[PDB]
Scaffold this motif. Structure first.
Motif, PDB file in Angstrom:
ATOM      1  N   UNK A 124      38.933  35.744  45.221  1.00 24.48           N
ATOM      2  CA  UNK A 124      38.796  35.081  46.517  1.00 24.48           C
ATOM      3  C   UNK A 124      38.254  36.055  47.550  1.00 24.48           C
ATOM      4  N   UNK A 125      38.804  37.270  47.558  1.00 26.47           N
ATOM      5  CA  UNK A 125      38.400  38.283  48.521  1.00 26.47           C
ATOM      6  C   UNK A 125      36.931  38.690  48.365  1.00 26.47           C
ATOM      7  N   UNK A 126      36.480  38.883  47.122  1.00 29.15           N
ATOM      8  CA  UNK A 126      35.081  39.274  46.863  1.00 29.15           C
ATOM      9  C   UNK A 126      34.102  38.169  47.225  1.00 29.15           C
ATOM     10  N   UNK A 127      34.534  36.924  47.072  1.00 24.19           N
ATOM     11  CA  UNK A 127      33.650  35.784  47.260  1.00 24.19           C
ATOM     12  C   UNK A 127      33.408  35.475  48.737  1.00 24.19           C
ATOM     13  N   UNK A 128      34.474  35.535  49.529  1.00 24.46           N
ATOM     14  CA  UNK A 128      34.402  35.232  50.956  1.00 24.46           C
ATOM     15  C   UNK A 128      33.665  36.325  51.719  1.00 24.46           C
ATOM     16  N   UNK A 129      33.241  35.996  52.932  1.00 18.74           N
ATOM     17  CA  UNK A 129      32.390  36.884  53.714  1.00 18.74           C
ATOM     18  C   UNK A 129      32.909  37.129  55.138  1.00 18.74           C
ATOM     19  N   UNK A 130      34.166  36.770  55.395  1.00 16.95           N
ATOM     20  CA  UNK A 130      34.760  36.930  56.732  1.00 16.95           C
ATOM     21  C   UNK A 130      35.516  38.260  56.875  1.00 16.95           C
ATOM     22  N   UNK A 131      36.272  38.613  55.839  1.00 18.05           N
ATOM     23  CA  UNK A 131      37.108  39.818  55.816  1.00 18.05           C
ATOM     24  C   UNK A 131      36.412  40.924  55.020  1.00 18.05           C
ATOM     25  N   UNK A 148      34.430  50.292  37.210  1.00 18.91           N
ATOM     26  CA  UNK A 148      34.695  48.986  36.610  1.00 18.91           C
ATOM     27  C   UNK A 148      33.459  48.319  36.003  1.00 18.91           C
ATOM     28  N   UNK A 149      33.673  47.629  34.886  1.00 19.77           N
ATOM     29  CA  UNK A 149      32.644  46.787  34.259  1.00 19.77           C
ATOM     30  C   UNK A 149      33.015  45.297  34.354  1.00 19.77           C
ATOM     31  N   UNK A 150      34.057  44.997  35.124  1.00 19.48           N
ATOM     32  CA  UNK A 150      34.440  43.621  35.428  1.00 19.48           C
ATOM     33  C   UNK A 150      33.616  43.169  36.626  1.00 19.48           C
ATOM     34  N   UNK A 151      32.937  42.034  36.464  1.00 20.76           N
ATOM     35  CA  UNK A 151      31.940  41.576  37.434  1.00 20.76           C
ATOM     36  C   UNK A 151      32.448  41.530  38.869  1.00 20.76           C
ATOM     37  N   UNK A 152      33.595  40.881  39.088  1.00 20.30           N
ATOM     38  CA  UNK A 152      34.180  40.797  40.437  1.00 20.30           C
ATOM     39  C   UNK A 152      34.324  42.192  41.045  1.00 20.30           C
ATOM     40  N   UNK A 153      34.842  43.121  40.250  1.00 23.32           N
ATOM     41  CA  UNK A 153      35.118  44.479  40.722  1.00 23.32           C
ATOM     42  C   UNK A 153      33.839  45.303  40.875  1.00 23.32           C
ATOM     43  N   UNK A 154      32.831  45.035  40.041  1.00 21.45           N
ATOM     44  CA  UNK A 154      31.506  45.625  40.235  1.00 21.45           C
ATOM     45  C   UNK A 154      30.913  45.210  41.588  1.00 21.45           C
ATOM     46  N   UNK A 155      31.071  43.934  41.941  1.00 21.91           N
ATOM     47  CA  UNK A 155      30.591  43.429  43.222  1.00 21.91           C
ATOM     48  C   UNK A 155      31.362  44.101  44.350  1.00 21.91           C
ATOM     49  N   UNK A 156      32.676  44.179  44.184  1.00 20.83           N
ATOM     50  CA  UNK A 156      33.520  44.795  45.206  1.00 20.83           C
ATOM     51  C   UNK A 156      33.147  46.261  45.403  1.00 20.83           C
ATOM     52  N   UNK A 157      32.861  46.975  44.312  1.00 19.08           N
ATOM     53  CA  UNK A 157      32.369  48.343  44.442  1.00 19.08           C
ATOM     54  C   UNK A 157      31.033  48.421  45.180  1.00 19.08           C
ATOM     55  N   UNK A 158      30.069  47.588  44.798  1.00 17.55           N
ATOM     56  CA  UNK A 158      28.791  47.574  45.502  1.00 17.55           C
ATOM     57  C   UNK A 158      29.003  47.342  46.997  1.00 17.55           C
ATOM     58  N   UNK A 159      29.901  46.421  47.343  1.00 16.65           N
ATOM     59  CA  UNK A 159      30.196  46.153  48.751  1.00 16.65           C
ATOM     60  C   UNK A 159      30.807  47.366  49.457  1.00 16.65           C
ATOM     61  N   UNK A 160      31.858  47.922  48.864  1.00 19.56           N
ATOM     62  CA  UNK A 160      32.524  49.106  49.422  1.00 19.56           C
ATOM     63  C   UNK A 160      31.577  50.275  49.596  1.00 19.56           C
TER      64      UNK A 160
END
Ligand code: MS8
Length: 256
Positions: A124-131, A148-160
């Motif tokens: 939920x956190x990775x998907x939303x764009x407010x927080x 991480x090689x888990x997609x959600x966490x890969x996205x979260x890393x790219x964001x961070x």
């Protein structure tokens, strides 16, 4: 006499904190907490005294592209300290470069945020764009995301990583302040989420644990102390002392 062991550590409530006093405190007396009690116990069992030194760069430890470490991990690699006694996470990448004792506590990464949102998980956190969200810079949680090689966490890393300047905070206190004052969630180890959410009722955990791992005492590779510290930790474990120490420093529930 046995050489005084140098202990690297870091300020992190309730593991290592400044003792409150109306009179001067020097040396180890400046500090208290779960890790200081752990040291009192370990040193009794192993027959040493020690000098507690806060890690100069204020970091736990991560490696850069050149393979160079910082934080407490670097203090051990460079034999600047005999032991690291802190909430120091036992990880594959660190275990290749330092020796860890057997674990004295287990925990997992979760999410710290304020109350009142529909976010119920990392997905939920990775998907939303407010927080916005992030982690403490150069700790194991940052590294978890980086590796991480888990997609959600890969996205979260790219964001961070894209927002590293603001998203990766210097320490846990800065992270908590960012949670309390801006639209930011902190990826944080669960035993600390438990501590803070029973003290500040505006804070909450979001979702469950993302992983599971332990804290251990760090030593330089090849240290003659590591196996002795492991044996002492198992003694304290079996005697119920680690459990008692946790109760002492986390007590007790303060929020609905
Ligand atoms: N235990 C981590 C450090 C840290 C993390 O990267 O999650 C930061 C600090 O954040 C608050 C909870 C205890 C600490 O965990 C480590 O050994 O790198």
């Amino acid at each position: 006499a046995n050489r005084t062991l140098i202990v690297t550590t870091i300020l992190e409530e309730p593991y290592v904190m400044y003792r409150k006093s109306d009179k001067p405190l020097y040396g180890n007396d400046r500090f208290e907490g779960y890790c200081l009690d752990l040291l009192k116990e370990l040193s009794n069992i192993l027959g040493f005294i020690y000098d507690v030194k806060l890690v100069p760069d204020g970091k736990y430890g991560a490696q850069n592209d050149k393979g160079e470490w910082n934080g407490m991990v670097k203090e051990l690699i460079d034999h600047r300290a005999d032991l690291a006694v802190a909430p120091l996470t036992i990880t594959y990448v660190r275990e290749k470069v330092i020796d860890f004792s057997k674990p004295f506590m287990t925990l997992g990464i979760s999410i710290l945020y304020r109350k009142g949102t529909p976010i119920d998980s990392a997905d939920d956190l990775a998907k939303q764009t407010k927080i916005e969200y992030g982690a403490v810079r150069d700790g194991s949680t940052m590294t978890f995301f980086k590796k991480s090689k888990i997609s959600t966490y890969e996205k979260m890393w790219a964001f961070m990583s894209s927002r590293q300047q603001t998203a990766l905070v210097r320490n846990s206190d800065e992270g908590i302040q960012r949670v309390l004052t801006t639209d930011y969630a902190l990826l944080m180890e669960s035993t600390s989420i438990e501590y803070v959410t029973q003290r500040n009722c505006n804070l909450t955990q979001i979702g469950g644990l993302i992983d599971s791992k332990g804290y251990g005492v760090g030593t330089p590779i090849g240290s003659p102390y590591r196996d002795k510290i492991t044996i002492a930790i198992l003694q304290l474990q079996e005697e119920g002392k680690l459990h008692m120490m946790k109760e002492k420093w986390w007590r007790g529930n303060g929020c609905p």
